[PDB]
Amino acid sequence: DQLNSSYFKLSIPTNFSFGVTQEYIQTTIQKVTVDCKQYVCNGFQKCEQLLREYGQFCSKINQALHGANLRQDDSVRNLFASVKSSQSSPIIPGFGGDFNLTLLEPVARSAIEDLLFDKVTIADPGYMQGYDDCMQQGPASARDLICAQYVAGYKVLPPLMDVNMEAAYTSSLLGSIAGVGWTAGLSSFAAIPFAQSIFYRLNGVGITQQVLSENQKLIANKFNQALGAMQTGFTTTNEAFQKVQDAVNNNAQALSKLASELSNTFGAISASIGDIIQRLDPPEQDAQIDRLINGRLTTLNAFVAQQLVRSESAALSAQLAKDKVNECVKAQSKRSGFCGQGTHIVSFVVNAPNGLYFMHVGYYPSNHIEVVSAYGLCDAANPTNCIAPVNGYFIKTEWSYTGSSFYAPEPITSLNTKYVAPQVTYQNISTNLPPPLLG
């Protein structure tokens, strides 16, 4: 309730909690290249002749697929260059001191990163020898997409950067996180303990230094509890984990559509061109082949358009991921809701199948209480001499200073106050005077 007086009511939390906000950003899509001649003609000369009358549609399709792959490679290279830090501290066992970062520390990929990949269901890439493996092993699952790709002739190209290189980029970023937030500018990197950086970040949210020293063990325990919740965070309820699964599903759906369309009749007597040749005389059969060709060509044009739309979305999302890494992972973020919910403290980045996974530690207020407060204090004897609290509120405990994010009354000092011009709202105190006004 607002007060009709110089004094104003303030609601300030007497308790603090740490929570991890999990976000998934899709920086890349699986690069798919389709062999138009095998997909539509199926090695039939009549199909090639009918396609030629329409034009070099199959030749145009191959060029478009190549362009999408190059766009994805350029986007991946730019995103990784942005994440890389010029100076980073080497990762060591027991990194973060009292705060436990063992899950973040690399095992190779970090344990949290591996869990994210293991929980998601991904078909085996088989990049080195998948075509040969599919023939000997058979379909891995009913309607296996990987085996279907080889029969159709379309192939899924491998990612521009290998998993080990991507893990190295995340490991360098984790080392840079501990000392990056010392002062403005990226020119100089200071090697400092992660715990020391967290206390400085908490001072920035306005918690008083004395409280941080008293609760140093408590702050470390609460941060560790939030990270433990993050380890169990991957679940069907979690939106971010579902988004990672959805991105894998979207790539899988595109492959499934190509295989399903071939078995579609498209108004032809038989889905198979060879069956049509046996079933009908050649001029009648050629008309049936044309119906299959038109549907298959339309599907390939739609698939190329779908890949182009997905590639455009991935490139824009990758630029957003780069902004997030600089704004939250490489510095504390003043902006609210851009990174973690509540007041952002620190962020960590692990690789995801189609992008980067962001975990943001946030400060959450609890047990709010209402205390009478004043905008400023002025000496009754001297009207000109006045002070205003910095990242704090003056409260009547006669008067004391409390940190903005955490209620903890402390004696008013020159360090926590700034001299200001006198205002009618400012109270006039003569009985008790803080040191900045005792002049």
Binding site: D35, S86, Q87, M128, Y131, D132, G138, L160, M165, F189
Partner: protein, 111 residues
């Protein structure tokens, strides 16, 4: 009794022989072909995706796939004119055959 076995896709994945020995049916599989080309060299390297080199200097097996007539420089390069993806890079010997290389992560200064 049905003899012809079909999957959800409706493809003929299985046939029962007259002798009664069931044979799985897999449609003949095409071998993927891609071209790695450098305009300045005016030479190209034949790329096979996900294919063992046995079915194909002789061919060089790489994690991306089998590459025909490829020589492995095995020298780390930070920047690649024609990256093969993964940690692989094809760098023309300048015309000499393009050389398989390893993309090199740039290590940050360590404090």
């Amino acid at each position: 009794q049905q003899r012809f076995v079909y999957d959800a896709y409706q493809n003929l994945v299985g046939y029962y022989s007259d002798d009664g020995n069931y044979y799985c049916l897999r449609a003949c599989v095409s071998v993927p072909v891609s071209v790695i080309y450098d305009k300045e060299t005016k030479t190209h390297a034949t790329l096979f995706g996900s294919v063992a080199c046995e079915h194909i200097y002789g061919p060089l097996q790489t994690p991306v796939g089998c590459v025909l007539g490829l020589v492995n420089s095995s020298l780390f390069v930070e920047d690649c004119k024609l990256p093969l993806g993964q940690s692989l890079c094809a760098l023309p010997d300048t015309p000499g055959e393009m050389r398989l290389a390893s993309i090199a992560f740039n290590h940050p200064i360590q404090v």
